[PDB]
Amino acid sequence: VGVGMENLIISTNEHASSDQGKTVSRATTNSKTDANTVGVSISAGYQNG
Amino acid sequence: VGVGMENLIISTNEHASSDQGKTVSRATTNSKTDANTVGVSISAGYQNG
Numbered sequence: 874v875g876v877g878m879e880n881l882i883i884s885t886n887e888h889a890s891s892d893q894g895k896t897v898s899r900a901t902t903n904s905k906t907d908a909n910t911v912g913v914s915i916s917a918g919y920q921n922g
Numbered sequence: 923v924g925v926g927m928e929n930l931i932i933s934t935n936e937h938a939s940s941d942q943g944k945t946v947s948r949a950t951t952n953s954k955t956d957a958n959t960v961g962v963s964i965s966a967g968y969q970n971g
Contacts, residue, residue, distance in 0.1 A: 896947075904955075916967075920969070921970070922969070922970055
């Protein structure tokens with residue numbers, strides 16, 4: 874009795890995945906600011922004096 | 923009866939994974955602001971008086 878092989882079949886055990894996603898968002902911002910400025914200027918020249 | 927070994931084969935049981943991803947997004951912003959300023963200036967000098 875002998876055994877002969879006629880075909881070899883390979884099944885790869887790899888895992889494949891796919892993902893699909895959607896996002897919607899809304900943001901609201903309120904801002905409040907105050908500023909203070911102090912300035913000093915010195916000028917000197919000759920305009921008819 | 924004796925047993926002799928001719929080859930040793932090692933199969934490492936480590937898990938390898940790869941991931942590929944793409945993203946597209948769009949944002950829209952609307953802004954509204956109001957500002958108020960009050961200023962006071964004092965000047966003193968000598969220009970023909």
